[PDB]
């Protein structure tokens, strides 16, 4: 890999759709250093996008590994985002408490 990002944070605003013709589940992952950053995660593939939409929840803590992508937009006719598609990337929910 020439392009690898790992982020651990809290999930928000999960939603699902189509960017172009690809199905995508997108969510915001807040990382915190003591500095907050609100990263846009996009999970691609009909099955993976549905797995993420279905089983990842608002407020879950996750570790994401994916690629940093820069889609310029700003110009016709989320600039930065993390592309997660297996087997290159994954989302791991970390479960605890109670």
């Amino acid at each position, epitope marked *: 890999s020439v392009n690898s990002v790992t982020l651990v944070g809290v999930v928000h605003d999960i939603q699902s759709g189509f960017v172009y013709e690809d199905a995508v589940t997108q969510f915001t992952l807040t990382t915190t250093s003591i500095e907050k950053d609100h990263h846009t995660i996009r999970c691609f593939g009909e099955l*993976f996008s549905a797995e*993420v939409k279905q*089983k990842v929840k608002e407020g879950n803590v996750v570790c994401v590994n994916g690629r940093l992508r820069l889609s310029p937009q700003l110009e016709p006719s989320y600039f930065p985002y993390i592309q997660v598609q*297996p087997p290159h990337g994954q989302v791991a929910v970390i479960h*605890g408490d109670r």
Partner: nanobody
Amino acid sequence: QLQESGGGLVQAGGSLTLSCAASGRTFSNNAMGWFRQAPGKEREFVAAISWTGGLLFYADSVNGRFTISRDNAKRTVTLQMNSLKPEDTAVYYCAARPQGDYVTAHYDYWGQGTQVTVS
């Protein structure tokens, strides 16, 4: 039908690789999970992996020491356990086809279990 293997007696600091071989019926298109049951405790979540392998769940007590993976060719789920502790002593059970959230012990199919004891 699901069959665990790879269990064993191991010393603290050690590693092990557990494996679950699965029938087409239980594995295909299905999320797969590992649970464990320690002496005197109800069984608890360890790790789970979606059909695509892109979505993983880890118990916070195991996160960053254990890795779950699956091989959709061999119909296997693997649990690589690193940095084992006494508290990891349990029978470990593979499961397939969760009825709800991947983290709760409600699955259509269960293995018979495999012992892991860490001295």
